[PDB]
Amino acid sequence: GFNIYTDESTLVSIDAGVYEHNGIIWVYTVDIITPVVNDPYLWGAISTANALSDVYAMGGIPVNALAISCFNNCEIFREVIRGALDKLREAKTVLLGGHTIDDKEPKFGLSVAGICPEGKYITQSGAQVGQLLILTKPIGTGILIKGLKEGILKEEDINEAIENMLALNDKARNLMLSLDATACTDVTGFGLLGHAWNICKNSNIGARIFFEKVPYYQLSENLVKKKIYPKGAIENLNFVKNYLKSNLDNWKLILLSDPVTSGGLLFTINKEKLEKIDETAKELEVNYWIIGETIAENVLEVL
Amino acid sequence: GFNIYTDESTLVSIGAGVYEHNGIIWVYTVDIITPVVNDPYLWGAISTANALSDVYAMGGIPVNALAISCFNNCIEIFREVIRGALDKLREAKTVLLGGHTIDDKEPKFGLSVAGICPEGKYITQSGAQVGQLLILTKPIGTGILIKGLKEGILKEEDINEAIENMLALNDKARNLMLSLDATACTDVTGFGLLGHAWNICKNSNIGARIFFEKVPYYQLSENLVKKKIYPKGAIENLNFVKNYLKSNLDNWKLILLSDPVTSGGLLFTINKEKLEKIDETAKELEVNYWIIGETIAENVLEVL
Amino acid sequence: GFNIYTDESTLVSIDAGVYEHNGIIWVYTVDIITPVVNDPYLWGAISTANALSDVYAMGGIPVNALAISCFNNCEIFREVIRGALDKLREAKTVLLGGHTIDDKEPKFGLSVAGICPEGKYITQSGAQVGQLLILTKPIGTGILIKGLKEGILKEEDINEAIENMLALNDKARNLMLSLDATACTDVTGFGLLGHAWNICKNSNIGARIFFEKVPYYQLSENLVKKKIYPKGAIENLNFVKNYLKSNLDNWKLILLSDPVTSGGLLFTINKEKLEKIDETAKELEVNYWIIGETIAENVLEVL
Amino acid sequence: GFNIYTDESTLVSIGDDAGVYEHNGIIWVYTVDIITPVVNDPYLWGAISTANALSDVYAMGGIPVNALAISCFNNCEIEIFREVIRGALDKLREAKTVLLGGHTIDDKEPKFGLSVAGICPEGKYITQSGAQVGQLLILTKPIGTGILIKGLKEGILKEEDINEAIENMLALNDKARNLMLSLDATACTDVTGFGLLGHAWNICKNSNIGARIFFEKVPYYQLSENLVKKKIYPKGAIENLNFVKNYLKSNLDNWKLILLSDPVTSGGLLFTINKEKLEKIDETAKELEVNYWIIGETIAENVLEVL
Amino acid sequence: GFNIYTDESTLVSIGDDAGVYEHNGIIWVYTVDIITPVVNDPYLWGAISTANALSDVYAMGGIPVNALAISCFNNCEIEIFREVIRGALDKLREAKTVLLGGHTIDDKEPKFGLSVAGICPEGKYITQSGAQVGQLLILTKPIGTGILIKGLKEGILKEEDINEAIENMLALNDKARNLMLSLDATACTDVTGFGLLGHAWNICKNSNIGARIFFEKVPYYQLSENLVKKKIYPKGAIENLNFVKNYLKSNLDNWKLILLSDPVTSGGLLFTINKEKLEKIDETAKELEVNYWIIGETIAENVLEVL
Amino acid sequence: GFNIYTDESTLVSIGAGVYEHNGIIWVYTVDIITPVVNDPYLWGAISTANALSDVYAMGGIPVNALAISCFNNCIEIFREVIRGALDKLREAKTVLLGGHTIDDKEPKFGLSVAGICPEGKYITQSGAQVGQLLILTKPIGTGILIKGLKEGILKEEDINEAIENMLALNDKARNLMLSLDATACTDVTGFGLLGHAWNICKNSNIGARIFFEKVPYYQLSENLVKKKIYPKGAIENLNFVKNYLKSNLDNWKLILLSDPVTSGGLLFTINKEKLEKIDETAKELEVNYWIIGETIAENVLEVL
């Protein structure tokens, strides 16, 4: 008889993007990293957790993925894939295959596709003034990873960091969504200050972070005080310098700028949500730290 | 780098449908008819013109089509039917994509047609206004002639003018119609002139006044109807409009006006200020026209 | 360079079915009903909640839908659609259009498409012996709807039933998933006994239901005792008679077999989950009633 | 129950994303055209660039259907682009063309344009290779915009001094397309960056024929003549002239050849018609509300003559 | 950067889901064939029905690629079907054909079969309308299964009494297809429900030619002859004979015409070859490991002669 | 009622790829070459045979192709090139879908080809076993002849046999190869006989022993190489296999054996028990063959 049918879709690309089609939202991300530990299996697992986090940070549910590496261009990859498969299985994400890239520097990662149901798509631009900044994993891995490279540390010294890098941000995403977070991102290569600033620039606001409230590995502090830290840290710190307000020692600023690998989620929530955060977090079995709040002035304050 | 792409489409089916996709509008129609003349080739050509008319009436440009018939189910003759359809389609710059056989025993042939309505020019039947003139581009009365031909009362040679008109594409009429900024349009086929005029009135929530003495029809059509010679479809069309018909005209006239038409012309509404151009526009486009009436406020069909 | 790509999909049809493609699961359902109240708007809203429940019952997240009615074949539909749109908006589901059917009997409903993330697809065949039967809405609407038709009741008398028929089963789905239910279905036209039996047949087990533990409207009891009940009730009761074991009065069996409109979810959970059901249910803001347990013998016991 | 269905399509592309697509009787044309700022008004830049991009489709006898915006975005500089888009949207609305989105390009040099898709109904696909000997060359807009835009940059002229040219650059070639189709033109192209001579030569090469152009019949802004004489002209004019020097025969003063080679922005259509068509060209143009100038005729010798 | 791409496809279907599809040089054939139980062994029913369905593709010179199971399922009666599927799977594996799934039909009468898709490489698409006069008719399996399956139902015979026929019904016509293609056959069909005469007539009608069949050259089960004489035969045989009575010329005893019209299940291929091909037919068949019988020749008169 | 449908596919790209979908396997390859003869038509035909060989070598049946060249970028001659490609494609029952122009200045032409491997018969280069015989279906040494022709040392008339072999499709050879149940196969082209033999050894983790006196090559090829006349590609191929080459043969022989071949024959491995059929099978299929060696355990190339 009489029939009416409509179809609509939108694609936004910034192999990264967001796709909406008749009510469903898909997010696509790509993330590849250089070895962080001298164990192929751990590298595959960590790289996978790191890549999936791009999706979790958007409130997404990872669905499938493609392995990406410099194969042939850079037996070890067999262990790398084994580690990636285990982490993917834990994440209930399907590996659809792999793509080789032209690069001589050893790198591995994934391109991931996820879904954001009921329009629950979270960006880095919805933050408002007077909200709390919540972080779900410690920082300082960059410092530890360098310590390893310099032969100052051994893997056994940083098992806590490795355990955190291995951890999926699925529980963190659930906490973030449960508290109706207005903005979210994960903490990786740009450091805690860099990613916080990303939220500040895209939301047109500023942030106040309290160093004493930021979780980090004791060993990261010990190493940074002895001038042991990655270059990315200096690059990150300088990137926010023209917007940074702080009278804290340089080592604290370097620590806060240290490139993180497979870090936790960094998101903003209203002060009222503070009433249920601990209980919600406990039920979900995920850690959280309240590190500061957003301000109107477009600067980054650290005290 | 930063890229944004959108896509949207809508499909509206009534049977026959209209599809819009990112700015372009396609119209789809289907029309099959029983033999109207003894010549298989002419039957193919006439059915084709008749099927394309559906698209022309909507302001569309026919693009492609699919032949539909019960061949092998109702063979050497269908070769001529296709030949006629192909020649007419070539004339209409429309491509034949193939054919489909339906479950039927009664000899019938026609086409499924797909066309496009450029610049959003999609002409419907619900945009007519009161005080406009009703224009018709082809005479009526073919149903009565076809009956006579079937009855053996007439020969094809007697109705050559009707055959020429049935064979004629409504593309020039569509252009005239668009050129005069028509507010509504439809083609005249099986439901008779009154029926299709009523379709416009119904959809435009308006009325129409038609003058019998201004309606073009074949002389032979009048002679046959006066001898009680006409299609049963004429009675069906008349009885269907009688609840909305206001007229005192003799029966033969109402029957003639209700006579099912094959590959008829276009019936459309234009403003009276266009009456100054219509003649020169029609001469250039090479298409005849007849002012048969005007729209009125009262929702009825006034046949005077 | 070297590339490997795989693609796989499965389609199962019983316009109803399940579709799996590279890790994602979609469920498609169709559900249309006759008017249940003399208010077009309420009918549109209720029919919508009822149709979406087919998806919720499978653990699905409704995404989009198409309206289905006997339009032209049977101004009122304008209010029907208005009601359907409101309920769809509440459900965060997109209406893509409508399809007309050949029928002279006034009916309206939806065809719905939903998603089941992380393989969380729930059927009616995973129930095991010794599990608890949980129900999330009262039964007895069929009796009340007849009472209305017979002019014995007026809409105002059954506002509680109307409120329940209007309610989305999204919170119930969340409870059901949170408790890791092994099987689930919603309660509609086949009555509570019929749908329970559906779980029994597909899971190859039986069920024991306690009448005194089943939630139902007081007015439904009053009416059924006075021989006021729909035919579907008798049809449902007879459908399970050759598998029914009970010494309860006929009115109680008729009530339990009464066709429900937009009923709650009926699912099975392990006894241990009983420890968190109340708290979980309270957090989700959804009611629940423990009406019985599954048994090994393939019969339906009611006491 | 017998059934027979056929499907066929052909795609011919030139390079980037410019091509012709035919599918079961319908013909689609795709083009892309981006230009550097023309005037100092952001809004006018978006509007003019749009008219310019749509022209590639009109010139092929096409009806624009939809488009995609293309600009350096963030790679060149974000308040002017808002105005640029506003101008584009207004011009597209006028052209009844839908904007489907946008695409960014890595370019430090400010540029904006559109990728456009249009259709050519009833196989009315007009190319640059169907011209015959003895046909008339028709132009629908004056030339000389390059020289005026140059003078505007040299501070020699003010924005207001070229309102006539701006009005012409803003005008859609849809009416010109209709005239061209109505007169059954055998070949058509629009006049842009390559200058009148260059675009005329494109028809000559692809049609393997020649052209004879009469300078005194060519429409151009008087202000453009005033400037070329004063050595005021874009370098693109010199390049264009040099591009056609191997096939050019003329004894005219250099300033005339420079004017004729001057890069045009959003110019008119340049097409060929049979001589008999002169009988109704004037009446048709007035009805369509478009201007036209008969600037010459095609000849057999594969050369370009200007006198 | 110049590019030209073309695409074309044609689809011809007969009714249900049986047709021929051509797309840019490749030809796909689709067929569907379901039969009622043939023997009392569920496994053999699935295996035989499969060989029977695949035959529709082999007969067209095709290579089966994938299939879909089709059965009444739940509409006819669920332990036998498990065995039926097992038989189908074994036969498909042997045919190197992938089972993509299944489809249920509303039918109370027990039936099972397959929808099959295959390809005809290098345009080797063999039909029933390319036969010429003076060609030989070749058959690759005996006929008479209808009469034996009938006797099995009448309790006249035991399952074991027809192991020879069962072995032939189980055999894939892939080797026969290879022989047919190797000898450059001009037309081919398989012999099923319509009987030998009926399927031979199909070639005659579509090729607009005639056939002359020699009864003494036709291979058939001796047990089949024994039964027809005793009035033991399927009614389908009578129907088939009547279907060809308007085009049949023969003076042979009725039991011979009944045998020749007897419905066959999973029969051999019936194809036409030029007489010169007899030179290598025997050697080729032995190499391919397939049997063959020359049963007659085609003639000009559009009739069916049996002597 | 109750219906279940599944779908699955895999794509493996190496550059060139293999695609499997619900039981069918398609292979995709690409091959372009510089002019080898002065005749534009012969160049088109030879390049085509050379491009199709990639598919034949895998046991495939070519279905369609796309022409690839730098025409207009490296015109009246390319008309002859296409004519030659079209004639050869017709012979191969392969359809030309169109063409693509690449960014290159050096005159080159070839095709992108798509083919199918029926009944799962996908022949690779990693299934050879020790103790098998190495079969070659066309002589080698065309690289040296083409060099001589380019140098003006030879005329096309002098190398008509090489041209006939370059023009020949490897479809008959593929059939022979499949007929003898070959365990591995490849075609001989630019990497020379030793190079392609090594590809099989490398992928099969086996070795090969080749007898120079059993290898077919054009007499003129031997004469030219002995006069220091040969393609630079020959030196490149030889130096590439020298780390896996065990031989004491004179330089000219190794160079000849490493000489880049154009539209060469197939090189495949079969069991010695097949040596009793190969001759009659080859006569029927109408294809020449040469037993040039046998596979060995040691992972090297023994050229004796």
XYZ file of N, CA, C and O in Angstrom, chain F residues 66-103:
152
model
N 42.138 -5.043 -17.404
C 42.168 -3.600 -17.579
C 43.522 -3.267 -18.218
O 44.556 -3.745 -17.755
N 43.516 -2.475 -19.283
C 44.762 -2.097 -19.937
C 45.437 -1.012 -19.108
O 44.773 -0.129 -18.556
N 46.758 -1.098 -19.005
C 47.538 -0.129 -18.252
C 48.715 0.340 -19.096
O 49.505 -0.473 -19.575
N 48.822 1.651 -19.286
C 49.917 2.223 -20.066
C 50.073 3.715 -19.801
O 49.244 4.332 -19.130
N 51.145 4.290 -20.330
C 51.422 5.708 -20.147
C 51.115 6.532 -21.394
O 51.686 7.605 -21.581
N 50.216 6.040 -22.242
C 49.868 6.759 -23.464
C 49.557 8.220 -23.157
O 49.038 8.540 -22.085
N 49.893 9.100 -24.096
C 49.678 10.535 -23.936
C 50.693 11.082 -22.926
O 50.837 12.294 -22.760
N 51.405 10.168 -22.270
C 52.433 10.510 -21.289
C 53.760 9.862 -21.678
O 54.748 9.962 -20.949
N 53.773 9.190 -22.825
C 54.976 8.523 -23.317
C 54.818 8.157 -24.790
O 55.442 8.762 -25.660
N 50.340 8.316 -30.086
C 48.915 8.080 -29.889
C 48.370 7.161 -30.979
O 47.573 6.262 -30.710
N 48.806 7.396 -32.211
C 48.371 6.589 -33.345
C 48.928 5.175 -33.239
O 48.402 4.244 -33.847
N 49.996 5.017 -32.462
C 50.619 3.713 -32.286
C 49.912 2.888 -31.218
O 49.802 1.668 -31.340
N 49.435 3.553 -30.171
C 48.737 2.861 -29.097
C 47.424 2.266 -29.585
O 46.834 1.414 -28.922
N 46.971 2.714 -30.752
C 45.743 2.195 -31.336
C 46.046 0.776 -31.803
O 45.201 -0.116 -31.723
N 47.264 0.582 -32.296
C 47.710 -0.721 -32.764
C 48.027 -1.618 -31.574
O 47.815 -2.829 -31.626
N 48.534 -1.017 -30.502
C 48.856 -1.768 -29.298
C 47.574 -2.356 -28.715
O 47.543 -3.523 -28.319
N 46.516 -1.548 -28.674
C 45.234 -2.005 -28.146
C 44.647 -3.068 -29.065
O 44.042 -4.036 -28.607
N 44.830 -2.882 -30.366
C 44.327 -3.840 -31.341
C 44.974 -5.201 -31.093
O 44.310 -6.235 -31.152
N 46.272 -5.194 -30.805
C 46.976 -6.437 -30.546
C 46.533 -7.043 -29.225
O 46.347 -8.251 -29.118
N 46.351 -6.201 -28.216
C 45.921 -6.685 -26.912
C 44.528 -7.300 -27.024
O 44.263 -8.365 -26.465
N 43.649 -6.633 -27.768
C 42.282 -7.107 -27.959
C 42.199 -8.442 -28.687
O 41.383 -9.291 -28.335
N 43.025 -8.623 -29.711
C 43.021 -9.877 -30.450
C 43.488 -11.018 -29.562
O 42.911 -12.101 -29.582
N 44.538 -10.773 -28.783
C 45.070 -11.802 -27.891
C 44.067 -12.109 -26.778
O 43.887 -13.272 -26.399
N 43.415 -11.070 -26.254
C 42.417 -11.263 -25.197
C 41.233 -12.080 -25.726
O 40.683 -12.927 -25.015
N 40.842 -11.826 -26.973
C 39.738 -12.566 -27.582
C 40.132 -14.045 -27.647
O 39.325 -14.931 -27.353
N 41.383 -14.295 -28.024
C 41.904 -15.657 -28.119
C 41.844 -16.317 -26.744
O 41.550 -17.503 -26.624
N 42.114 -15.534 -25.707
C 42.096 -16.020 -24.328
C 40.701 -15.977 -23.690
O 40.548 -16.268 -22.503
N 39.691 -15.607 -24.470
C 38.319 -15.512 -23.963
C 38.267 -14.663 -22.687
O 37.588 -15.003 -21.714
N 38.999 -13.555 -22.714
C 39.077 -12.629 -21.591
C 38.541 -11.267 -22.047
O 38.884 -10.778 -23.126
N 37.710 -10.654 -21.211
C 37.097 -9.369 -21.539
C 37.899 -8.157 -21.061
O 38.368 -8.123 -19.931
N 38.047 -7.161 -21.930
C 38.762 -5.936 -21.572
C 37.714 -4.961 -21.026
O 36.770 -4.604 -21.724
N 37.888 -4.532 -19.783
C 36.931 -3.637 -19.139
C 37.211 -2.155 -19.344
O 36.331 -1.322 -19.135
N 38.433 -1.832 -19.755
C 38.799 -0.443 -19.964
C 40.299 -0.258 -19.842
O 41.068 -1.159 -20.185
N 40.719 0.901 -19.343
C 42.138 1.167 -19.204
C 42.463 2.235 -18.177
O 41.613 3.058 -17.820
N 43.708 2.216 -17.709
C 44.193 3.165 -16.715
C 45.563 3.718 -17.102
O 46.452 2.972 -17.527
N 45.730 5.030 -16.959
C 47.000 5.673 -17.283
C 47.793 5.923 -16.006
O 47.255 6.440 -15.028
N 49.070 5.551 -16.011
C 49.913 5.756 -14.838
C 50.906 6.897 -15.057
O 51.145 7.314 -16.193
N 51.469 7.399 -13.962
C 52.434 8.499 -14.005
C 53.819 7.969 -14.363
O 54.628 7.690 -13.478
